Amino acid sequence: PIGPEDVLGLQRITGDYLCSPEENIYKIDFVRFKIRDMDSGTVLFEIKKGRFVRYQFTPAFLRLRQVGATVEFTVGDKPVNNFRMIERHYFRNQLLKSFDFHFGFCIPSSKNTCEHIYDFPPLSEELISEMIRHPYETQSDSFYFVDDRLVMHNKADYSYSG
């Protein structure tokens, strides 16, 4: 049984998913995801209607300071309390940054909306160059908890070449 404290100290991407789809007993289902630059309002990525997503971004992405993510999700009939996401980004298994977001109150049996603010870590010129040169070696784990219990785990990797 996996809790926040089990992921909050991880120094590498996991080799596998830490939970199965079945453990999502609350039937949480993301139906919209949109990321924008908070300094320009430019929409960097959007999808409407999936445990793994591969992102193709540009070099300029790595110069962003603050991005806003908007997420829409439905929930099943069981109450969802203390819905929390811990998302850890790594380059070649060096931690870049971990983000810890607590969702607001989730209405059962309905569509919910949330905005998460990511403040980018400072990236050295060397690191930016390497990240551009090494697509898909930037990787993230997204751990989702309800009442301190892991119920979803999504993965992603990132290119900054295109």
Residue numbers in the entry: 59 to 107, 126 to 238
Provide passages from the article that reported this PDB entry:
UNC119 is a myristoyl binding protein that plays a significant role in maintaining myristoylated proteins in the primary cilium through cycles of solubilising myristoylated proteins and release at the primary cilia by the release factor ARL3GTP, which is specifically activated by ARL13B in the primary cilium. Interestingly, T cells lack primary cilium, but recently, it was reported, in Jurkat cells, that UNC119 plays an important role in shuttling LCK to the plasma membrane and specifically to the IS with UNC119 being proposed to activate RAB11 to traffic LCK-containing endosomes to the IS. LCK undergoes co- and post-translational modifications including N-myristoylation and palmitoylation, which are essential for the localisation of LCK on plasma membranes and RAB11-positive endosomes. Here, we demonstrate a direct role of the ciliary protein UNC119 in trafficking LCK to the immunological synapse.
We sought to confirm the mechanism of action of UNC119i by successfully determining the cocrystal structure of UNC119 with UNC119i to 2.21 Å resolution. The structure confirmed the binding mode of squarunkin A (blue) and its mode of action, which is indeed a direct competitor for the UNC119 myristoyl binding pocket (grey surface). Thus, Unc119i provides a means to competitively inhibit LCK binding to Unc119 and could be used to determine whether the steady-state distribution of LCK in CD8+ T cells relies on Unc119 function. Before sparse matrix screening, the protein was incubated with a twofold molar excess of squarunkin. (A) Structure of UNC119 inhibitor, Squarunkin A. Crystals were obtained in the JBS Kinase screen in a condition containing 30% wt/vol PEG3350, 100 mM Sodium acetate, pH 4.6, and 200 mM ammonium acetate. N-myristoylated LCK peptide is shown in purple stick representation and UNC119i in yellow stick representation. Cross section of UNC119 is shown in green in cartoon and surface form. Critically, this work also highlights that despite squarunkin A only binding to the lipid binding cleft in UNC119, this was sufficient to prevent LCK localisation. This, and previously published work in Jurkat cells, suggests that the major mechanism by which UNC119 acts is by solubilising LCK and trafficking it to the IS as opposed to through activating RAB11-dependent endosomal traffic.
